[PDB]
Design an enzyme around this catalytic site. Structure first.
Site, PDB file in Angstrom:
ATOM      1  N   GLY A 180       2.905   5.598   8.799  1.00  0.00           N
ATOM      2  CA  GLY A 180       4.324   5.813   8.591  1.00  0.00           C
ATOM      3  C   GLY A 180       5.186   4.625   8.964  1.00  0.00           C
ATOM      4  O   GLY A 180       6.366   4.559   8.640  1.00  0.00           O
TER       5      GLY A 180
ATOM      6  N   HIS B  83       0.820  -1.213   0.000  1.00  0.00           N
ATOM      7  CA  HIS B  83       0.000   0.000   0.000  1.00  0.00           C
ATOM      8  C   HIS B  83       0.859   1.270   0.000  1.00  0.00           C
ATOM      9  O   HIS B  83       0.337   2.370  -0.258  1.00  0.00           O
ATOM     10  CB  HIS B  83      -1.031  -0.032   1.143  1.00  0.00           C
TER      11      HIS B  83
ATOM     12  N   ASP C 276      -0.965  -7.234   1.236  1.00  0.00           N
ATOM     13  CA  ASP C 276      -0.293  -5.962   1.473  1.00  0.00           C
ATOM     14  C   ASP C 276       1.209  -6.207   1.639  1.00  0.00           C
ATOM     15  O   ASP C 276       1.740  -6.189   2.732  1.00  0.00           O
ATOM     16  CB  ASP C 276      -0.875  -5.238   2.684  1.00  0.00           C
TER      17      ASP C 276
ATOM     18  N   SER D 153       4.127   1.360   8.135  1.00  0.00           N
ATOM     19  CA  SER D 153       3.830   0.254   7.224  1.00  0.00           C
ATOM     20  C   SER D 153       5.051  -0.218   6.527  1.00  0.00           C
ATOM     21  O   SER D 153       5.906   0.575   6.116  1.00  0.00           O
ATOM     22  CB  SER D 153       2.916   0.739   6.095  1.00  0.00           C
ATOM     23  N   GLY D 154       5.081  -1.505   6.297  1.00  0.00           N
ATOM     24  CA  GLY D 154       6.183  -2.085   5.545  1.00  0.00           C
ATOM     25  C   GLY D 154       7.351  -2.429   6.441  1.00  0.00           C
ATOM     26  O   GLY D 154       8.230  -3.203   6.047  1.00  0.00           O
TER      27      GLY D 154
END
Length: 251
Positions: free
Chosen positions: A192, A41, A90, A194-195
């Site tokens: 901020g 995303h 995701d 994510s990932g």
């Protein structure tokens, strides 16, 4: 990250920062000399691959460091199941334009193999430079935050998100996601983050059990953060990237 603490430099050397047009937007996890796993995303179709940069080896995002390396991307491969504003899939593989050299501050985390199971209640750590309270950014110099969170059973996460939440709540998919955190509030990943990695320890080794994906407001009550479950994508990752070899995780 809300409710956590500042990591010391070198502590989570696989954590990276992804910027888009120079602005930090997401985290990611270094998984080899040239590949990073992050959340799909963070890489909407309309964004230009050449506008992203990855910063490795930095604990304070707004402090120069001779140990930091910055790389551009040569490929972004989102999972093909991924739909924008949807929960499924995701996760994205990012290939750096050139391989980087490892150091005390830059080292890959092991990917869990397809059959890996991490016990419910294991305390894993999530890290990132995302918000520290709802709509409040981490302040300069942006010390990397870390937070210990317990893995929660898929039955419980299914309850919390799919049964006891309104219909507009994203859908928790038990096969491919894990929630981890607290119902108490104030301890979670946030915008901020994510990932970035949910790093879980087994027998002294750290595994990328999950990738920060979604949740409610930063640190919301009764909604522990949700992560893409990396083991569920291990066969996809290895099939796309022969160099990436997921590791079997001890019982």
């Amino acid at each position: 990250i809300t409710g956590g603490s500042s990591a010391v430099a070198g502590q989570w050397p696989w954590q990276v920062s992804i910027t888009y047009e120079g602005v930090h937007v997401c985290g990611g996890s270094l998984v080899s000399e040239q590949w990073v796993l992050s959340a799909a995303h963070c890489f909407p179709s309309e964004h230009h691959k050449e506008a992203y940069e990855v910063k490795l080896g930095a604990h304070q995002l707004d402090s120069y460091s001779e140990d930091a390396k910055v790389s551009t991307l040569k490929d972004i491969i989102p999972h093909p199941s991924y739909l924008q504003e949807g929960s499924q899939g995701d996760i994205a593989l990012l290939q750096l334009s050139r391989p980087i050299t490892f150091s005390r501050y830059i080292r890959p985390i092991s990917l869990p193999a397809a059959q890996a199971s991490f016990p419910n209640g294991l305390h894993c750590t999530v890290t990132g430079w995302g918000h520290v309270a709802p709509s409040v950014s981490l302040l300069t110099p942006k010390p990397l935050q870390q937070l210990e969170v317990p893995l929660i059973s898929r039955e419980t996460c299914n309850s919390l998100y799919n049964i006891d939440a309104k219909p507009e709540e994203p859908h928790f998919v038990q096969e491919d996601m894990v929630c981890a955190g607290y119902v108490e509030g104030g301890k979670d990943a946030c915008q901020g983050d994510s990932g970035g990695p949910l790093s879980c320890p087994v027998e002294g080794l750290w595994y990328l059990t999950g990738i920060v994906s979604w949740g409610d407001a930063c640190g919301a009550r009764n909604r522990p953060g949700v992560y893409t479950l990396a083991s569920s994508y291990a066969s996809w990752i290895q099939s796309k990237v022969t160099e990436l070899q997921p590791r079997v995780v001890p019982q």
